Amino acid sequence: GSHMAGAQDFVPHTADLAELAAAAGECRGCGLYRDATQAVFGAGGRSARIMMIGEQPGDKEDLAGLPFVGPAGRLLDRALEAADIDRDALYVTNAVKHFKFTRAAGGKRRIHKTPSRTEVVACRPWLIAEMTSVEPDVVVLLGATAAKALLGNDFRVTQHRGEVLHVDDVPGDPALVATVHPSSLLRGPKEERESAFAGLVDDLRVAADVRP
DNA sequence: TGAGGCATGC
């Protein structure tokens, strides 16, 4: 890449998810490996028919080494239940595999920082390897960073959420459904939260109803 | 504390 080397040559030629996950722990495709605790690879099995892709680890994901374990993951768990999506059908990952954060000079708390488009493009080869291994029927794009990673920078989740989409550039031609990131339900006003949760559930139901 | 899609800064 122009700013970052990219992950492409760190990605081993394999569909084994465990081998991919170990190799991501050695990735230096961008700068984010340096300050992060560990790579946070996807969770689930190749038999999954629904792949869900978030933005990046948060604080709790970085410490645990698993995706969607913090507050946003708790919300996602409730939305999955409300749509009767069995977790055995899921492979869950993020567009970026190492936690990007900063700290105030006189503070200790790690402050989440949105990955740059540069870092998203650098990390995308891992996502392509995951999609090739899992071959999902449908991909849920949880938020703008993930949706733009596969649908292009001009894509707007608030414009096209809940629509079943297909693009050429994507291995295996799965259906794609974009929605808002579960953390946005928390970031927004408490009085919009109920309607926003119902909207996430409705978008998940669209994805769950995709028939290959 | 935990987005999104516009903007401005260097």
Ligand code: SF4
């Ligand atoms: S964020 Fe992705 S590309 Fe960057 S170092 Fe980590 S695994 Fe590699």
